[PDB]
């Protein structure tokens, strides 16, 4: 006769991940590589969003 013993599942061998990246990144260069920095009496807060 013929019998159902087990079922094979062909498990995956690797992981693929693909995501979107915006061309503009951030003005950290305008902050860390800035030519001039503010006095400790008038601190420079720049908003990043």
């Amino acid at each position, epitope marked *: 006769g013929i019998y159902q013993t087990s079922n094979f599942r062909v498990q995956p061998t690797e992981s693929i991940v693909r995501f979107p990246n915006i061309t503009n990144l951030c003005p950290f260069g305008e902050v860390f590589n800035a030519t001039r920095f*503010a*006095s400790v*009496y*008038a601190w*420079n807060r720049k908003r990043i969003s």
Partner: nanobody
Amino acid sequence: QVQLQESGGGLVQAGGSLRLSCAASGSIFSPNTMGWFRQALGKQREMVAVISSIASTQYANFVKGRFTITRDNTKNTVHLQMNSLIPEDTAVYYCYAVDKSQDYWGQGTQVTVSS
């Protein structure tokens, strides 16, 4: 890039008169406050005078009744009529834009008075 143009100093005999000028460029948002400061070689920044957008003028006791600040609203510039000169006024002066964000300084104007 906020820039302050300072001009009008030099060598003047005792009793003469000069007219310094700072023009402000860049952002310089409307509620601004600008002063002039003094520094002689070996001393600190001495607050000479200050003017705000309110048109009020504040002067120190060092130069009582001698130096004046004049405002130009059209170009938003300032001129300091510096008269009745005395050797104790021998110091390089600098510009101070309070504004609302960081305060930008000038490059300097040499003022010498001696005989």
